[PDB]
Amino acid sequence: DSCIQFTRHASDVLLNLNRLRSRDILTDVVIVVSREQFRAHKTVLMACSGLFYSIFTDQLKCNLSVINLDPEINPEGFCILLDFMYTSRLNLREGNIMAVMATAMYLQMEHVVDTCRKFIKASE
Amino acid sequence: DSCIQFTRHASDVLLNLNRLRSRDILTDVVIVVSREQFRAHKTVLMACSGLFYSIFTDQLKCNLSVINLDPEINPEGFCILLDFMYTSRLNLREGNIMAVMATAMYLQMEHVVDTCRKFIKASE
């Protein structure tokens, strides 16, 4: 087509979605991790994670307001990944990289799994 | 902080939100314009428009599944703006610029109003 494009539009949308998350506006699901609860927007979780995409496209699970993650999932690793979903920023540290990579593999967040693999390989 | 950032994350999120819109997945509102109906995600509309932000933060209107726009709003102008919300791409043409600017002013989409004003000024 002959469209024009606003460079900062996608980033501004994500910034506003994160502001809605902060203020708990229109959040429609609770993610339960080892008895730690995280409120979020189903559509943002689907847009970021192959696991959530599969969960919320299921005809029965699409209607659930609570999703319980596998007990092996670490709440801090989940929190870091949820922050990444809403900001594009990943708080990757020596002390959390193993939990973050394991959580990203489970959530099916391929780009995160990729940078974790590379950061681990650099330290070996 | 000491975060790393994935450059394409925000664009990939918006692309996936538009794929959900195309497939009518988790859309939670119908916008009615001069008897033309548009399905969308409330959170995306809020993230893009000062008008929708004000509508869906209202304690009564946040629960509506149908929103009727002012009868002066042109369905094509709305359609172009809805596409922009989900893609960052604006199909601005000599034949639609007046309707697009009028719709963007009503929806409170300041960056769109800005480029329309500039494109109109260049033709005078």
């Binding site: 469209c3 024009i4 494009q5 606003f6 | 604006l90």
Partner: peptide, 4 residues
């Protein structure tokens, strides 16, 4: 704004 840019030409994409």
């Amino acid at each position: 704004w840019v030409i994409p």
